[PDB]
């Protein structure tokens, strides 16, 4: 029951 983080910055 948590929001997902976006992935790390590719760059």
């Amino acid at each position, epitope marked *: 029951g*948590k*929001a*997902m*983080y*976006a992935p790390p*910055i*590719r*760059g």
Partner: antibody, heavy 124, light 113 residues
Framework: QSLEESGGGPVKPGGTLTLTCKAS?????????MCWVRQAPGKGLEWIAC????????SYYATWAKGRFAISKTSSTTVTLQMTSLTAADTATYFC?????????????????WGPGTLVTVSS | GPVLTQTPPSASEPVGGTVTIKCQAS??????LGWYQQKPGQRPKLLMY???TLASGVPSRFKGSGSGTQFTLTISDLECADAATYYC??????????????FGGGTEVVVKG
């Protein structure tokens, strides 16, 4: 879905206000970021703080803001911004806004929902 | 950063013309970039997110583009209804301490009718 801010108005330098954002016509199957953005007259949008609507209630602050502003979920439909030690530099229209969380990466990952704003004047 | 800066500070184009607004991120942000329209005395309006995805309702003559540190909002076939200030914004949360929400400084578009 819509948002409405309240609690704005005149306040003296050194004082406090608590702004409230009320959400109407929303669901709870997804999680969102509820953010506060302010705008001084004739100036640009300036992000203040966000909080996620999951149980964690994780919050994120602009660096200039973290010391004097506090953001809170006070119910399933209300978020508050408590603003303290105020000066002329905090005079602005304060907007409540909402955007999706990342999810599968297929969401609207930006502020798609905005209130009309409430005007804070910090003045003697 | 990431600090967002916009150029030009102001643009003036005739109805039916084209305007290109530039957004620079002081460090790489992939495509975590939104564009907003704001007319004087009104709330901001989401036009574009993930750099190039059109928000629902927004006309196809709005075209978002870019990646890493450079982004553009290109408005084709200008209407008077396009007279406003436009802002780019970071929108990213990667962890409890890795996040960005700040806006760029804004670009005013004046439409010559």
């Amino acid at each position: 879905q819509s948002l409405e801010e309240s609690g704005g108005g005149p306040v003296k330098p050194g004082g406090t206000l608590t702004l409230t954002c009320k959400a109407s016509g929303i669901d709870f199957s997804s999680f969102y970021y509820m953010c506060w953005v302010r705008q001084a007259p004739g100036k640009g949008l300036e992000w203040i703080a966000c909080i996620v609507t999951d149980i964690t209630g994780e919050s994120y602050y602009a660096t200039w803001a973290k010391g004097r502003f506090a953001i809170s979920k006070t119910s399933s439909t209300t978020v508050t911004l408590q603003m303290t030690s105020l000066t002329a530099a905090d005079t602005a229209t304060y907007f409540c806004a909402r955007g999706d969380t990342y999810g599968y990466g297929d969401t609207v990952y930006a502020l798609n929902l905005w209130g009309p704003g409430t005007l804070v004047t910090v003045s003697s | 950063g990431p600090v967002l800066t916009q150029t030009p500070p102001s643009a003036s184009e005739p109805v039916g013309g084209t305007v290109t607004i530039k957004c620079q991120a002081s460090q790489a942000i992939d495509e975590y970039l939104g564009w907003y329209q704001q007319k004087p005395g009104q709330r901001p309006k989401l036009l574009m997110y993930y750099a190039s995805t059109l928000a629902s309702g927004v006309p196809s003559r709005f075209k978002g583009s870019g990646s890493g540190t450079q982004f553009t909002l290109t408005i084709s076939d200008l209407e008077c209804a396009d007279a406003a200030t436009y802002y780019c914004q970071n929108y990213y949360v990667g962890s409890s301490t890795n996040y960005a929400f700040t806006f760029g400084g804004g670009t005013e578009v004046v439409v010559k009718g």
